[PDB]
Paper text:
P2 is a myelin-specific protein of the fatty acid binding protein (FABP) superfamily, which is able to stack lipid bilayers together, and it is a target for mutations in the human inherited neuropathy Charcot-Marie-Tooth disease. P2 belongs to the fatty acid binding protein (FABP) family, and the structure of P2 is typical for FABPs: the body of P2 is a barrel formed of 10 antiparallel β strands, and the loops that connect the β strands cover the open ends of the barrel. Inside the barrel, there is a large ligand binding pocket, typical for FABPs. Phe57 is in a central position in the portal region, and it is believed to regulate ligand entry into the internal cavity in FABPs.
Mutagenesis of Phe57 into alanine (F57A) highlighted specific roles for Phe57 in ligand binding and structural integrity of the portal region. P2-F57A was crystallized in three different crystal forms under similar conditions, and the crystal structure was solved from all of them. Phe57 lies at the tip of the β3-β4 loop, close to the bound fatty acid. The fatty acid, originating from the E. coli expression host, was modelled as palmitate. In line with CD spectroscopy, no large-scale changes in P2 structure were induced by the mutation in the crystal state. In different crystal forms of P2-F57A, helix α2 and loop β3-β4 are in slightly different conformations. The bound fatty acid adopts a more elongated conformation in F57A-P2 than in wild-type P2, correlating with the conformation of the β3-β4 loop. For a deeper understanding of P2 folding and intramolecular interactions, residue interaction networks and centralities in the crystal structures were characterized and compared between wt-P2 and P2-F57A; all six independent F57A molecules in the three crystal structures with different space groups were included in the analysis. The possibility of crystallizing in different conformations indicates an increasing flexibility of the portal region, linked to the missing stabilizing C-H…π interactions of Phe57.
Author numbering: -1 to 131
The structure:
């Protein structure tokens, strides 16, 4: 299953092409400002087979809880209502969000002790790197 190395508190130390990603998502202007400024902590935890990903920033949180492979309802930080699934592929924790006939993916993998999140929307690709705190 999910490597226990995902578990813990993660801090954003690098982000590339995130504005373009948000723009691809049709994110509102206020949300883009927030997104480009925020340097969130991501907390990954588990209770039995329920995995939780909590994202905390200065004055805004998001949280999802899920079982691998089981679709669930999600309200994203930019307020999309998506049907989402998190799966495990070759150690990569892969999230897909679907809404309005659209699709975006967030793939998280551990690389040299860091967590690398790759976001893709219509060929726009984001990379956000987290270090263990
Ligand atoms: C809740 C703190 C973050 C605020 C960012 C708001 C801008 C909209 C973000 C929507 C998609 C974000 C995906 C981030 C992936 C990650 O690096 O965990």
């Amino acid at each position: 299953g999910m490597s226990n190395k995902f578990l813990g508190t993660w801090k954003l130390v690098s982000s590339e092409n995130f504005d373009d990603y948000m723009k691809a998502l049709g994110v509102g202007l206020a949300t883009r400002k927030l997104g480009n400024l925020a340097k969130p902590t991501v907390i990954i935890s588990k209770k039995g087979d329920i995995i939780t990903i909590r994202t905390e920033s200065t004055a805004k949180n998001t949280e999802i809880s899920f079982k691998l492979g089981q679709e669930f309802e999600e309200t994203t930080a930019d307020n999309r209502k998506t049907k989402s699934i998190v799966t495990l592929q070759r150690g990569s924790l892969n999230q897909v969000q679907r809404w309005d006939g659209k699709e975006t993916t967030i793939k998280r993998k551990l690389v040299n002790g860091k967590m690398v999140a790759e976001c893709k929307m219509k060929g726009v690709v984001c990379t956000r790197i987290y270090e263990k705190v």
